[PDB]
Amino acid sequence: LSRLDPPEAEVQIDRLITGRLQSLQTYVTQQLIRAAEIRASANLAATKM
Amino acid sequence: LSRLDPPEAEVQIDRLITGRLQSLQTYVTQQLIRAAEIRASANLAATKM
Amino acid sequence: RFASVYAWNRKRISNCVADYSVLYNFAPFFAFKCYGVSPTKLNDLCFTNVYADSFVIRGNEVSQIAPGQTGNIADYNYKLPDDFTGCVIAWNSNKLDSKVSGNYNYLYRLFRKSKLKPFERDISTEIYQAGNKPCNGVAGFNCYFPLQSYGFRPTYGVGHQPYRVVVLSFELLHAPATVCGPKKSTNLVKNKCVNFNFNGLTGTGVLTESNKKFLPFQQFGRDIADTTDAVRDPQTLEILDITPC
Amino acid sequence: TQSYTNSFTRGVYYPDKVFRSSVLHSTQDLFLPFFSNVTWFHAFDNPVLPFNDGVYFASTEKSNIIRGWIFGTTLDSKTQSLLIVNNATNVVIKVCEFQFCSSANNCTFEYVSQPFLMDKNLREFVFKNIDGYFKIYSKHTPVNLGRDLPQGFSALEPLVDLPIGINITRFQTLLALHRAYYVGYLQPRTFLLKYNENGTITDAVDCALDPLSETKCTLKSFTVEKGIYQTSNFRVQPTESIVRFPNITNLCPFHEVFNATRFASVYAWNRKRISNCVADYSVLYNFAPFFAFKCYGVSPTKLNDLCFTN
Amino acid sequence: QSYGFRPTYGVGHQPYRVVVLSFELLHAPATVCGPKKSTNLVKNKCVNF
Amino acid sequence: SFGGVSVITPGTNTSNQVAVLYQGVNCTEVPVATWRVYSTGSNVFQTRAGCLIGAEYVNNSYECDIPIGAGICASYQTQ
Amino acid sequence: IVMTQSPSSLSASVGDRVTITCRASQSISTYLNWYQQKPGKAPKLLIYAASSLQSGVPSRFSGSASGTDFTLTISSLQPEDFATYYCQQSFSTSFTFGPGTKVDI
Amino acid sequence: DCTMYICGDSTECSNLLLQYGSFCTQLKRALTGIAVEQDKNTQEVFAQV
Amino acid sequence: VQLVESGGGLVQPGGSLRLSCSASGLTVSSNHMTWVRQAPGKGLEWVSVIYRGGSTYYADSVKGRLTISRDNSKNTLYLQMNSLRAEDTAVYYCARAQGGWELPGAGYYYFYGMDVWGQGTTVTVS
Ligand SMILES: *[C@@H]1O[C@H](CO)[C@@H](O[C@@H]2O[C@H](CO)[C@@H](O)[C@H](O)[C@H]2NC(C)=O)[C@H](O)[C@H]1NC(C)=O
Ligand SMILES: *[C@@H]1O[C@H](CO)[C@@H](O[C@@H]2O[C@H](CO)[C@@H](O)[C@H](O)[C@H]2NC(C)=O)[C@H](O)[C@H]1NC(C)=O
Ligand SMILES: *[C@@H]1O[C@H](CO)[C@@H](O)[C@H](O)[C@H]1NC(C)=O
Ligand SMILES: *[C@@H]1O[C@H](CO)[C@@H](O)[C@H](O)[C@H]1NC(C)=O
Ligand SMILES: *[C@@H]1O[C@H](CO)[C@@H](O)[C@H](O)[C@H]1NC(C)=O
Ligand SMILES: *[C@@H]1O[C@H](CO)[C@@H](O)[C@H](O)[C@H]1NC(C)=O
Ligand SMILES: *[C@@H]1O[C@H](CO)[C@@H](O)[C@H](O)[C@H]1NC(C)=O
Ligand SMILES: *[C@@H]1O[C@H](CO)[C@@H](O)[C@H](O)[C@H]1NC(C)=O
Ligand SMILES: *[C@@H]1O[C@H](CO)[C@@H](O)[C@H](O)[C@H]1NC(C)=O
Ligand SMILES: *[C@@H]1O[C@H](CO)[C@@H](O)[C@H](O)[C@H]1NC(C)=O
């Protein structure tokens, strides 16, 4: 921000934004599968109890 | 590589790299779900045995 | 008579505080366009060291100052690493610098074997060996000097008359700081969410006193995700801990 | 007596001027490989050693016969040469040309500061030169073992990073005439560090020595349990190069298109087809100066090596 | 559109000469090649070709 | 020729000797062209999964400790 | 490392001295050798370490070194001394040879 | 093998790929986990005696 | 003390050759030896060297083609030449070097000079 004016800073900001979004999506994508596995284990535990 | 110098070869290399990464992610994304289904089937088989 | 396009003189500037308003107080610029950083915010920045490379070129040579336009004079004289933090100035003061017959004191080396590395100043004078003859000093066929004589006539148009150009080069390093822009340093506060501009580390947070060691060479703190969690005071040499609001 | 002695685990230093509290960093820089060999120079003496990438000058004498070093490329009146010399209570550095310490005519460079010999005893000095700089790191430690490097751990801290901008290829030791050391070379490697609590390096591991070190470098840890952990890959490297451009050798003219008069108007332009030849574009440079050699398709440098249909 | 050229003119009125090339980068037919020393052929060992 | 390598080790607490498995190179075909100081030998053994360097081959049979592949295991027994 | 000899062509007569010299690029201390190549048969070694003798020939041959410039001296250029002369550096593993020096009547 | 699939042998492609952070490690970890689970699945189905 | 060479001949391009340098009074077990190639009227050029320890270091140009090898006693070393590019047609000599130690992290530097030379053998390519 304190190196360039917006007109050619927008490209860098956009590159960083898309990279961060791509990195963030995978976290929830993995979390959903892990939660499904844990839910299966919890159902088995409830049945055993 | 033997057509252009790096300064304007970087854009092509980056385009190919991001395309290949995007194509590669889907493979493991589908593999995880298929493995989960196979694991459910294996648990059912173990219970039957 | 700064220097020729080859054998350019290099000036190192450091240990000062300088303003770029003075360069506006100068002759009109042939091309103030420059590559590295926006000229507006140059007045407020801190630097490790700066360099000045001043010399003379032709009009047909003013278009290849950028790293990607090499081929005519940048081929064997001056090359850039294509990153080139900082930027250039041109002010074509050749008007009161010329000769009726020609300026013979300015030379460029075109008879060189191959491309040179960026930031290179070759000074050796050897006979050019373009051909299949064992040159020993005859200076005839297949034997050429590594120089190209030329003259400057003031009646010429653009592209033949001389021009003058100076090139800067920055580093934007963090640890060593010798050149900083002119700003009124303000009193230090703490224990309240404020904006801080320590040498350019623009940020917001609360500053407290820390028990870090910070050996004399060390002056920054770092951790995961490149967050500066500590900083050494530029003036009183006191270490401070930064915490988000 | 240039006998060889083991260097054990010694030669690491702080790579960056920042503070890290408790991490396991992974750098990549010039270092001294672990468990290497170094050449003792017990002393006709003072060989003119090469300077490849760096030097690890280590000394263990107390009488301070060892003055500063001499660094150069030609070590004559044609090229500049460093003249590091330790005073009684000062340090002196010169850069510009010398003949034999006696001319020092062209140029002058100077820098003074506190001595390097304040303080059996052991001293280390790492010399590196990159991007027109000169980095030296030192650290003094006391041992009494004798003429052998201790099997301990001690990092180094920077002293000065003065910029010079000179080729350096030859290295010589200088001693006082009226009134012994080890040399080892540096190579590019990858290390893993152990900043403990105060930026004090207490351990380090080299990532190219043994398979166990490779595994310890893959996953960032100093302890590994039973497993079949994977590591990097291997691939056979090529040996020779072969190029087979076609049989034909005739050179198409490619020139009448260039030197002629009244080619054509901008409309009704003449079209010339060139094929069935081998031609070079160097002859194009042997021509009148170009108004605009800037062009769109391919880089002009590699045009000389390409094959085309027409 | 008739016009004339006078040598006393400046840039933009005096004539200029330009030549234009055009390639195809095709693979099957090859008639024009750069000058390089063809080397001997080797085989049964990892090499650059 | 190309491939990957794997390191078979017991815990660093117990010892430091390791063995190296090359992924499907059929050993003698191209075992070795620094890190390759392992004698290019010392009981090189061949299995269905690759080339194993640094381990013997006992005719006995025990319980699996470190799986390898194709019905082969490894351990750190004392002679 | 590149060395050049000067002069390349030597023309003198009997009872004279040689003043051919070898010019290096980097510093090679005093490690340089002077070789005599007969016109066809085989090379011969005269001066090693830039100042010593192999003891094959009498004191007519000598070698002087100054900085990184080396010079050869022959007391009497007798008629049997007519061949090619070479200067070779030995400071490094990769030896290098000079272009060559011609001796003429 | 991510670094060989995305880039064949060129080193500058690898240099560009290192600018994308740790994306290869996640894929390698996921694939290794899948492989270990597949090896374990066929054990409790049969190895009951 | 003398050493002589053998094994030359006229060989078509892309062939194989095996030159032999046999010595009488110089043991090959512990010595430094080297090969020097002279093209017709073009000067000399070192091409290969083997040390006492047993390591090798070829020149930059002839790399990956030539191979020097030493015989266990019998005082006759062998230089094998692979595919040729019609440039190696020249006269080959074998010689012995004085000595120099083994600074680790680098090669061998301090050498004195060759002492004994053979007559050499001519190798030609058609
Ligand atoms: C060693 O230090 C002494 C001073 O401690 C140096 O002597 C001074 O040198 C400066 C620079 O030329 C002079 O201006 C002073 O007048 C000198 N003072 C005295 C008392 O001599 C000396 O030059 C230093 N020498 C070296 C080799 O470092
Ligand atoms: C980091 O610094 C602290 C503070 O200096 C070190 O803690 C000291 O440890 C020594 C060892 O016995 C004690 O004598 C001191 O009293 C401690 N300082 C205190 C308690 O303020 C700590 O050891 C350092 N970390 C290292 C060296 O890894
Ligand atoms: C280091 O020196 C010892 C002692 O001679 C020697 O046995 C060993 O092989 C040397 N190591 C290397 C890597 O040269
Ligand atoms: C510096 O070197 C140049 C080039 O040799 C020489 O002409 C000049 O006289 C030197 N300056 C001196 C000796 O002050
Ligand atoms: C330093 O050496 C390199 C290679 O030897 C050379 O290309 C370069 O020009 C030298 N530096 C200067 C300033 O001449
Ligand atoms: C062209 O082919 C002929 C026949 O194979 C061959 O004799 C000739 O050497 C070839 N020309 C070149 C330049 O390779
Ligand atoms: C061919 O080109 C040259 C330039 O190198 C020129 O001097 C010559 O006049 C041209 N040929 C004709 C017939 O004009
Ligand atoms: C290492 O092994 C020893 C003996 O087997 C044991 O006493 C010790 O606790 C082990 N270390 C750890 C960290 O478990
Ligand atoms: C390895 O190669 C040898 C020789 O070609 C062959 O006999 C053997 O069967 C091969 N091994 C495998 C597992 O293919
Ligand atoms: C060990 O196993 C091998 C495998 O074929 C066999 O040939 C050999 O006879 C066995 N030896 C003993 C002592 O069991």
Side-chain angles (χ1 to χ4, degrees), chain F residues 56-73:
Chain F
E56 283 81 5
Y57 184 83
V58 189
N59 274 19
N60 209 284
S61 297
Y62 317 97
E63 299 304 272
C64 198
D65 291 353
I66 309 183
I68 286 189
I72 286 298
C73 303

Side-chain angles (χ1 to χ4, degrees), chain F residues 26 28-29 46-47:
Chain F
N26 190 16
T28 53
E29 309 305 279
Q46 170 77 58
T47 184

Side-chain angles (χ1 to χ4, degrees), chain C residues 95-231:
Chain C
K95 305 308 152 86
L96 71 164
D97 195 71
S98 284
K99 183 57 67 179
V100 298
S101 89
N103 281 138
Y104 274 59
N105 49 357
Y106 300 154
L107 275 300
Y108 50 71
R109 171 170 30 230
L110 197 52
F111 303 85
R112 204 261 191 170
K113 52 173 289 295
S114 60
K115 269 201 200 143
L116 79 166
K117 314 304 294 182
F119 295 141
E120 190 66 31
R121 179 175 40 173
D122 63 324
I123 210 163
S124 88
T125 297
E126 192 174 359
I127 315 293
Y128 186 23
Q129 207 194 4
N132 53 1
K133 279 186 171 308
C135 296
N136 307 325
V138 190
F141 176 54
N142 284 346
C143 314
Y144 304 94
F145 283 163
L147 269 191
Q148 203 276 335
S149 178
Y150 55 93
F152 286 150
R153 274 83 68 189
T155 189
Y156 270 129
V158 171
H160 296 336
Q161 46 198 357
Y163 302 90
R164 293 180 181 177
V165 57
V166 70
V167 175
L168 314 177
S169 59
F170 290 174
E171 62 281 347
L172 282 192
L173 209 47
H174 295 285
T178 61
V179 183
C180 286
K183 281 192 33 175
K184 317 310 161 285
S185 166
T186 67
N187 166 0
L188 187 150
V189 296
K190 45 175 67 175
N191 303 75
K192 42 164 55 61
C193 178
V194 285
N195 299 25
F196 43 83
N197 197 345
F198 287 161
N199 288 348
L201 282 72
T202 303
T204 65
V206 297
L207 295 89
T208 58
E209 299 279 9
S210 48
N211 46 56
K212 308 298 203 35
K213 286 325 168 184
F214 278 176
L215 311 181
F217 56 99
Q218 279 161 333
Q219 65 181 357
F220 287 167
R222 276 275 184 83
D223 66 345
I224 302 97
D226 272 8
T227 45
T228 70
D229 57 352
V231 64

Side-chain angles (χ1 to χ4, degrees), chain D residues 85-92 110 112:
Chain D
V85 167
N86 296 295
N87 207 340
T89 45
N90 207 6
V91 161
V92 173
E110 185 67 29
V112 298

Side-chain angles (χ1 to χ4, degrees), chain B residues 9-49:
Chain B
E10 300 318 319
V11 298
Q12 316 301 116
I13 301 308
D14 189 280
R15 205 99 50 78
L16 277 166
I17 281 168
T18 184
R20 299 236 176 95
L21 267 170
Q22 183 54 350
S23 59
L24 190 43
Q25 204 80 40
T26 314
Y27 177 45
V28 308
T29 286
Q30 308 263 340
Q31 283 287 278
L32 283 147
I33 303 149
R34 209 162 274 136
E37 159 187 321
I38 292 293
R39 159 147 49 77
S41 197
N43 276 10
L44 177 55
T47 313
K48 289 179 86 81
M49 179 95 93

Side-chain angles (χ1 to χ4, degrees), chain B residues 1-6 8, chain D residues 296-299 302 305-306:
Chain B
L1 278 191
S2 76
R3 271 258 320 274
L4 294 174
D5 62 358
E8 67 267 18
Chain D
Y296 183 78
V298 177
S299 65
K302 313 143 161 163
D305 297 336
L306 267 178

